[PDB]
Amino acid sequence: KWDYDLRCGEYTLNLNEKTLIMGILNVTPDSFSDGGSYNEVDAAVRHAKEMRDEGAHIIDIGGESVSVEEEIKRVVPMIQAVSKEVKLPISIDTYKAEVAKQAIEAGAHIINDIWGAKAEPKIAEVAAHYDVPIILMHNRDNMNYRNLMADMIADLYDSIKIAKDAGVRDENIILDPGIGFAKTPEQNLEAMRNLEQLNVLGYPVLLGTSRKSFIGHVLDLPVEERLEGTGATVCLGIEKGCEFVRVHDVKEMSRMAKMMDAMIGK
Amino acid sequence: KWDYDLRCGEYTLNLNEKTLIMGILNVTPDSFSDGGSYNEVDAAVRHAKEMRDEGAHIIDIGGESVSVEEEIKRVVPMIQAVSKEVKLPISIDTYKAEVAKQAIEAGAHIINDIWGAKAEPKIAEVAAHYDVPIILMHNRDNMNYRNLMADMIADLYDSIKIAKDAGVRDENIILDPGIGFAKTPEQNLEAMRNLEQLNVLGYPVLLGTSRKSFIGHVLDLPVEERLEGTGATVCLGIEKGCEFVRVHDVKEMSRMAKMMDAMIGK
Ligand SMILES: Nc1nc2ncc(COP(=O)(O)O)nc2c(=O)[nH]1
Ligand SMILES: Nc1nc2ncc(COP(=O)(O)O)nc2c(=O)[nH]1
Numbered sequence: 001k002w003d004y005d006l007r008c009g010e011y012t013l014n015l016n017e018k019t020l021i022m023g024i025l026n027v028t029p030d031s032f033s034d035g036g037s038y039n040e041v042d043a044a045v046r047h048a049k050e051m052r053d054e055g056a057h058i059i060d061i062g063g064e065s066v067s068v069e070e071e072i073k074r075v076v077p078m079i080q081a082v083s084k085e086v087k088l089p090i091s092i093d094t095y096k097a098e099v100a101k102q103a104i105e106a107g108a109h110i111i112n113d114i115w116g117a118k119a120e121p122k123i124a125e126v127a128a129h130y131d132v133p134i135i136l137m138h139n140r141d142n143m144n145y146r147n148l149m150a151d152m153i154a155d156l157y158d159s160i161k162i163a164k165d166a167g168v169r170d171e172n173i174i175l176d177p178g179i180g181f182a183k184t185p186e187q188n189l190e191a192m193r194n195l196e197q198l199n200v201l202g203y204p205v206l207l208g209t210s211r212k213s214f215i216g217h218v219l220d221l222p223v224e225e226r227l228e229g230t231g232a233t234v235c236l237g238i239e240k241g242c243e244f245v246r247v248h249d250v251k252e253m254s255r256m257a258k259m260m261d262a263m264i265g266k
Numbered sequence: 267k268w269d270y271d272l273r274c275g276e277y278t279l280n281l282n283e284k285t286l287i288m289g290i291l292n293v294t295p296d297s298f299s300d301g302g303s304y305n306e307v308d309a310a311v312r313h314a315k316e317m318r319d320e321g322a323h324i325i326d327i328g329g330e331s332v333s334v335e336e337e338i339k340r341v342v343p344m345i346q347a348v349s350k351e352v353k354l355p356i357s358i359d360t361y362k363a364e365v366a367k368q369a370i371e372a373g374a375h376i377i378n379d380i381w382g383a384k385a386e387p388k389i390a391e392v393a394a395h396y397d398v399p400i401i402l403m404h405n406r407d408n409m410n411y412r413n414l415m416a417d418m419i420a421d422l423y424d425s426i427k428i429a430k431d432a433g434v435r436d437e438n439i440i441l442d443p444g445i446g447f448a449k450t451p452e453q454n455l456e457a458m459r460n461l462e463q464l465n466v467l468g469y470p471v472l473l474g475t476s477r478k479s480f481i482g483h484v485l486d487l488p489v490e491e492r493l494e495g496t497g498a499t500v501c502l503g504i505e506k507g508c509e510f511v512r513v514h515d516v517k518e519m520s521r522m523a524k525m526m527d528a529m530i531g532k
Binding site: 189192193215218219221228229231232233235236239252253255256258259260262263264265 | 455458459481484485487494495498501502505518519521522524525526528529530531
């Protein structure tokens, strides 16, 4: 059903047997340091440890939510520690070219770019050079669509043409609808409801909805009260064919994914 | 989209605006009494109270999991108390004709028959007489299918012809795939995966998967560790068009339902 595996250095991720879980590494910095101090790096390692024990297949590590050089000095020790101590592929959640490059150098395995190569096109180049999967998220500086889904597909397509023109092999491309970016609450709902359309593009799809505003908007609930909303988006996502979910609650979300997988026959 | 409402005496349930939540009333009897003693009836009222506060639209009350007359003496006080104190329609989960009749008399609003009129055909008759919705679950005394879904649809059809021949109006008929009855673990999965087929029959569908074996079978987890599995089945159910879910965890399941509803545009 997917004629290839996701190549990630020492680890390989099958795309057919299960929905793969990307665990969001929570990266609480030291108000007292700029580097890789014991507390932040240790909390980070503990948290990746726990997400590994809970069912996570990938650990996702982000720098900013803010100069370039800071982002590295912050993010790089996190990667060296987690990669050394947790045997799962790490993805680096940055859009900056220099950041991606350091992170890979430091041991990151996948690039994760919330601007799908548009904020910093050199990033495709890095991806190309190190031969790593890169995630291209849908994003843009405006909410003005003539047709959300057709535009979303258009915009994503633009990211692929950037990735490809830079040397990126089809098999290293992953797409993501960027739910929660550049979309109104109702537009997010509509992307959800049409997610399967992304499949015509022929690439694996990652969905990132964990705890976002639009769940709050529907359910009327704070971020920490959004587990069941997230759950629904994960389920609907998997039914609609997505291959990855990006999630805070690895334990719960792993179980829902596993049950969906058995239902839909994945 | 449904050209009618569910008529239930003093209450009316719209079938278009949301997935309706049926809360499973947990009915822990007194090892010391046969009637309507303070503890069992009071725990029951408290539990229906809490499920009402959590988002339940219907309260479902069951007698046995066991003579006929016992079932009544047990179930009837439960209905009088809950109906008097909780303003939600109550359904009576029995297949026995005499039981259904007492329950309605006592104040039950919907019949809920895990043998869809086949164990006790007079039950359709009762339903007909009091003009109440009756749920017809798929069931049978064997697991031998030539084609699960086609047979399931066949068997269900047999229940409708019994309900109809007894006077039951189309608008009072609800169907249910009976996941967890007369099916192997893998067969349950396959019913799940083909639930939408039930819609060709033209009746509203209730799904009852809460905490059942097959979730345990997939996830490898005790009944009390089955919330996320249940969740997935609820989501997949709602996406596949079902109008009701029958669930233990009313709070969590209400939220998932609400989020699904907003996604699928219900
Ligand atoms: N690939 C991908 N990356 C992302 N990074 C950050 C956030 C938003 O930040 P948060 O998860 O920390 O709220 N969402 C995404 C997403 O949806 N997809
Ligand atoms: N309509 C309907 N009624 C039911 N009654 C009992 C049980 C199984 O008992 P439990 O819910 O107490 O485990 N399942 C159903 C069902 O799936 N649908």
